[PDB]
Amino acid sequence: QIDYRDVFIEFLTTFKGNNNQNKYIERINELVAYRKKSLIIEFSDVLSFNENLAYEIINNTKIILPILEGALYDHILQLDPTYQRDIEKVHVRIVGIPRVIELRKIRSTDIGKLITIDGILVKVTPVKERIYKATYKHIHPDCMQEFEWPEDEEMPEVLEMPTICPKCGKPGQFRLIPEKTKLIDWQKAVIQERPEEVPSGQLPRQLEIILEDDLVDSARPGDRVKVTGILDIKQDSPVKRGSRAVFDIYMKVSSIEVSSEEDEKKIKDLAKDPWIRDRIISSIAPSIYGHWELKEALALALFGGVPKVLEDTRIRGDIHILIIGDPGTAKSQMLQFISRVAPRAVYTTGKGSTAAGLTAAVVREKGTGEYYLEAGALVLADGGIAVIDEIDKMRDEDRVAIHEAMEQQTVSIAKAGIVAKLNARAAVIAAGNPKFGRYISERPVSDNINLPPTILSRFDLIFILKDQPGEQDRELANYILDVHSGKSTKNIIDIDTLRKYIAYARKYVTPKITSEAKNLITDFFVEMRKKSSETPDSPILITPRQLEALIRISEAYAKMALKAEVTREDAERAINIMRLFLESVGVDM
Amino acid sequence: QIDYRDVFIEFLTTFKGNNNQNKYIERINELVAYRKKSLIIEFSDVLSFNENLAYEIINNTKIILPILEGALYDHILQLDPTYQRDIEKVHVRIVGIPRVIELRKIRSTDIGKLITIDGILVKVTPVKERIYKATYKHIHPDCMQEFEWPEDEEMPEVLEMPTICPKCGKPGQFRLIPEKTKLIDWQKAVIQERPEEVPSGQLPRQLEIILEDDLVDSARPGDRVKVTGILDIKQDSPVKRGSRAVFDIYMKVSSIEVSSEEDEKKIKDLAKDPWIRDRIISSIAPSIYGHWELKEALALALFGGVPKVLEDTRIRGDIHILIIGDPGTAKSQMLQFISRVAPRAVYTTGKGSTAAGLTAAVVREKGTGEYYLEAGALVLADGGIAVIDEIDKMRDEDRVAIHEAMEQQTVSIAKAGIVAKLNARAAVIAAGNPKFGRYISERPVSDNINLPPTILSRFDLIFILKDQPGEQDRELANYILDVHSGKSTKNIIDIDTLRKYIAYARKYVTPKITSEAKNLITDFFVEMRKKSSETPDSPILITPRQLEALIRISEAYAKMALKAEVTREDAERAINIMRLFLESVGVDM
Amino acid sequence: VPSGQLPRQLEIILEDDLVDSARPGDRVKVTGILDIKQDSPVKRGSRAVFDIYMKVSSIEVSSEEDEKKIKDLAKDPWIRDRIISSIAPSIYGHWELKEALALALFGGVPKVLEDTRIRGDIHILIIGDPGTAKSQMLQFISRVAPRAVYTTGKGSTAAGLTAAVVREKGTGEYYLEAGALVLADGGIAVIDEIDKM
DNA sequence: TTTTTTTTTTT
Ligand SMILES: [Mg+2]
Numbered sequence A, B: 001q002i003d004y005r006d007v008f009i010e011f012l013t014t015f016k017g018n019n020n021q022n023k024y025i026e027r028i029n030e031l032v033a034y035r036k037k038s039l040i041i042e043f044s045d046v047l048s049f050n051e052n053l054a055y056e057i058i059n060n061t062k063i064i065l066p067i068l069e070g071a072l073y074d075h076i077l078q079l080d081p082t083y084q085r086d087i088e089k090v091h092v093r094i095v096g097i098p099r100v101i102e103l104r105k106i107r108s109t110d111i112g113k114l115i116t117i118d119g120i121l122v123k124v125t126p127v128k129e130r131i132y133k134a135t136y137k138h139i140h141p142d143c144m145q146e147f148e149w150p151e152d153e154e155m156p157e158v159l160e161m162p163t164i165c166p167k168c169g170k171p172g173q174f175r176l177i178p179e180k181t182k183l184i185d186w187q188k189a190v191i192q193e194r195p196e197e198v199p200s201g202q203l204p205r206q207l208e209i210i211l212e213d214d215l216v217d218s219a220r221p222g223d224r225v226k227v228t229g230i231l232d233i234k235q236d237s238p239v240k241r242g243s244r245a246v247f248d249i250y251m252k253v254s255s256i257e258v259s260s261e262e263d264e265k266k267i268k269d270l271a272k273d274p275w276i277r278d279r280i281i282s283s284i285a286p287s288i289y290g291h292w293e294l295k296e297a298l299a300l301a302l303f304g305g306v307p308k309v310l311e312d313t314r315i316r317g318d319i320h321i322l323i324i325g326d327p328g329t330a331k332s333q334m335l336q337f338i339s340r341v342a343p344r345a346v347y348t349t350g351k352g353s354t355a356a357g358l359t360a361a362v363v364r365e366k367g368t369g370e371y372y373l374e375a376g377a378l379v380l381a382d383g384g385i386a387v388i389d390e391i392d393k394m395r396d397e398d399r400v401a402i403h404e405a406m407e408q409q410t411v412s413i414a415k416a417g418i419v420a421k422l423n424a425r426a427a428v429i430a431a432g433n434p435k436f437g438r439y440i441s442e443r444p445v446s447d448n449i450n451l452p453p454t455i456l457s458r459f460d461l462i463f464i465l466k467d468q469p470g471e472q473d474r475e476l477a478n479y480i481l482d483v484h485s486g487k488s489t490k491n492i493i494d495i496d497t498l499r500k501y502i503a504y505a506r507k508y509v510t511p512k513i514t515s516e517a518k519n520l521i522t523d524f525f526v527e528m529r530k531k532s533s534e535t536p537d538s539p540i541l542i543t544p545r546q547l548e549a550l551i552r553i554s555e556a557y558a559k560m561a562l563k564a565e566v567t568r569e570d571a572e573r574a575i576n577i578m579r580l581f582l583e584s585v586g587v588d589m
Numbered sequence C: 001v002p003s004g005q006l007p008r009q010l011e012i013i014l015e016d017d018l019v020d021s022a023r024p025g026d027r028v029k030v031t032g033i034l035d036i037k038q039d040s041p042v043k044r045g046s047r048a049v050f051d052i053y054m055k056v057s058s059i060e061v062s063s064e065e066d067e068k069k070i071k072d073l074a075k076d077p078w079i080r081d082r083i084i085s086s087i088a089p090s091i092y093g094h095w096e097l098k099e100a101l102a103l104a105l106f107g108g109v110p111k112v113l114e115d116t117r118i119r120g121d122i123h124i125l126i127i128g129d130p131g132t133a134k135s136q137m138l139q140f141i142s143r144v145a146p147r148a149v150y151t152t153g154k155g156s157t158a159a160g161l162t163a164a165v166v167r168e169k170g171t172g173e174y175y176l177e178a179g180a181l182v183l184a185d186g187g188i189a190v191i192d193e194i195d196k197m
Numbered sequence D: 001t002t003t004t005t006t007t008t009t010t011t
């Protein structure tokens, strides 16, 4: 009843933020600057400013939402006249609706109301076009008339053509005119409930959501999102007789949330401590005590090196880590920790999940038989980390293709008339059990993990975990039971703060090699080759790949402290960690 | 509104090229001389001549293209009256449009405007025919009348039949008359975005394009192309009731660019250098240190020999290279460089390495349940270079399947009621590791390679790469670190001009053997046979295939310098590189 | 099921608040009205034959005196010995095996830690000579457990154990069907002749 | 995709 348009306008311009800065005006100006056409607002702010306005939004969103958008559009064009002729319709979206419904609990009483759903995206269709105002021509030798059939109404989701020509009042044949037809971007996605909320002995439920206008391509598949909108009954084919008076339901998305400058200031401040490197090492897997060398390697892997892209060649910048632990050594604890702390990670096994084990595969279409490509674990992890538990029982097909993916970081297909090349620039962290149950120290590494020696040369660092029944058993037994009761350490960095720290470093730090670091690395590599040459039965191969590992590892240390250059200290740490790796495999360095 | 066909005609004649030669006048002459029926206009020459003409072409493309084409047709008619009743309608093509949009960024606002898209062609359908003006006959005993159904309007993409006979104003049934129906050539192709612009973790997207009239068969799958035209919605099955007002997007191609006299001048200037051969060799994989003899061999395989086609036989002209080396010897890095510089190359490491994936596969056509052949790696590489990696890891039964393709350059299949032959004229470059992962000096050459002599005789050159630590490690380490520091070698022919040089040489230079070269080659072959007979323990058979390898190599050296005949120096170079290959396998001379 | 015959099936319809009142594999008692099923009325041409379906009005799955009886049993100091003696009374000996089988029926307490999860279920493997009554006890366990699934190594497949994809031919749609392991969630899965799988 | 029996190519 009461015109909230004035109330809405003053609320946007007079919203007391964290410091009465009127942040809504700031984002409105930002919207005009880049022509974003979409303004999001928080339900809490509306309720605090005027609870009566908030109730109207959450109860009569069908009626008052277009009214509010018109008021906002008038304000924007009044503020800036150049916004016209570019955007004819602005969008206002609400977030933080208190009406949260579990996906399995949806019933008929929730149809037509504004609700929010939390779940996981599984499928996303390519962007398409939907008609909301069509133009038709009456093909009747006396008419030759054009009109817009859905008069004074948006074209419904069911494509219907006129039966009587409105201009001539006659039936006949009508032809669509694409050139005078209004279109809107249209995308379809599927949301699946999280496994935590699935009841015992039941399969997870699914829901179809529709993304339109700027909401298209707002979330990659496999992301946890929060979706707000209206539910409605799907009509796949209304002309299909055969009873079936039952229908599915779908969601018209109005706002989607996935999963700051202040963070950057605190991240740079956190890097001011000269002992930041050791603090990061301590913060890695705080649950597990000891294993400092293994912890140090994992920190370097997350940061990684700087890849080099040249005119004729590309040089890998990722770091690969192999762990061979005895059963019961709890090798899966920090692996789960790595997945959580990594900004982007993929968890899988040796056999993979789909037909494409790790690299890729070519699959005939089920309906038409056409050949297409399915991405493997390595491809899906591009730009991030690929954690592969149980590396020793990969598919036989992948045992050869993994050579190229782990070194050239590409997957090449020349099968069934399809030629393609897929990027696989992903750091690989893998764990495998010894082939003889328990690791044997005297035996080499190749005959202990059941992998070709060529693969071993592709791993920057290899570590062996042995369940030694020493004095630590009592402490380990106490430690295991303490984890059962619950305990934590002190003076660490939480995963949430650490995750953004790693992400910031990987996006803005590209260390460069200095002359002093260059000389130190050169001498060690020459020393490395001499030692391996003397022993005619070296358990490991010392190839030029090892020299690349020294460069990559040293860069990660500089990146760990957000250093612009690589100095002697970074190089010295890189040499020392490689020295321990050679001792672990049994090489007298 | 003012007209511009006078300006358009004026521009065609009054435009001045780089040397004021009026190329468009010359281009018109070529169009008349060869009855080309299509003209190409560079956009950079339109706004320079008249900026006003540029925008109206871009904006009002639909209502200005027929006007300009009609004016040009009259200009051709006066230039050559006989052009009439040979080509009734002419087309003009505009290239270099400033509006370039990434495939993933196409939205609703882009429909109906002239845009440009860069991508990769993946598949092309066979040429078909489309009706744009139909003729019908009213089957009603009174009528017996014939007419063209779509009056003063081109036939729409949806085939629509009249409901009322225009000649008699009555309903009934109508019969199409194919003899009086006007047709236009029609072809459908699919374009794919380049891997560079694909976001990480996502599969590349595709778009459907339509080529009509002379644009058909202007490109082949696997080509980097730049396409220009207008987008539209796809009404594939409008008769399919059941709602679904959602439509796809396809592209109406107006002009296409694949992949210049100035290039010819640059190429000819390079050939004038007496040491052009050395420069080309030095330009092969500059980032790799050493391996000069291997770099020389790779250059020869890029150019190849001269195939001989006779009335009774065919002789292979391609050169095959085999590389065996220890892990981490830059085998894969050098092979990846070949695919960048080769005009056409195919890569296959581990997937598709079976017999079916390498030559051809018999797959059941699920559309009709029958069988048909699918091209393999070698067939897809016909006319180019096939690169095979990790050949030693292939199964022996799978490896023998390429014996026919490597020599007879054909693939023959007799399986499941299918008997067919396919052309596989491609050069094969293969890399692999020794039998025991690393080369062992104690064992002989035969068991180190671990390949049957039947396949070894088909390789023109074989090289063994040994990673022996010594005093060269310091030089190698310095070179690698210099590469990582951004330092690059100078006086190197870059990539794209090297690719143009190879493409020009292959299709324009055909060296011939002289009497001087005949005597040198004959003498060496006799000497080679005698030496092989001396030692029966050699792992390499000296067959007549080795004699033809000398001829092929000598021709490639002449082709490398754009020479029309093989002289004494080219034969000496061919003999010298043969000596190194023989020494590399323990066969002294 | 009579001798030499296959089990029959009936279709039931749950509406309003009766939805999601049971899970697959449960033994239920259902009350309602029977009616003939019409699905394709437009499909003219013969077939005046219809199937019957049940319109559910109330459903029961599988209480005070029983709780009292249970408490009285637990009061005996030797309740543990009585329970073990009640496992497969027709089998002689095998006291140690019977004791372990009793533990698996009850199980432990699952624990959720900061990062990992500790299962409360107990896994038992039995290796014995032929004729050692191995299959007899497993049949008893599958019958006495409140929720159990009995499978055989030869009569099971990977799809049948975890989940099977069923293509809805009516609409060309894919959906999952619960396997043996999923149906046994919260219960006991019995696998006979695991070595022959 | 799925279980099944069959001939077939190819995993
Ligand atoms: Mg390699």
Ligand SMILES: [Mg+2]
Pocket (backbone or CB within 6 Å): C134, C135, C136
């Ligand atoms: Mg038994």
Ligand SMILES: [Zn+2]
Pocket (backbone or CB within 6 Å): A138, A140, A143, A145, A165, A166, A167, A168, A169, A170
């Ligand atoms: Zn009309």
Ligand SMILES: [Zn+2]
Pocket (backbone or CB within 6 Å): B138, B140, B143, B144, B145, B165, B166, B167, B168, B169, B170
């Ligand atoms: Zn008529």
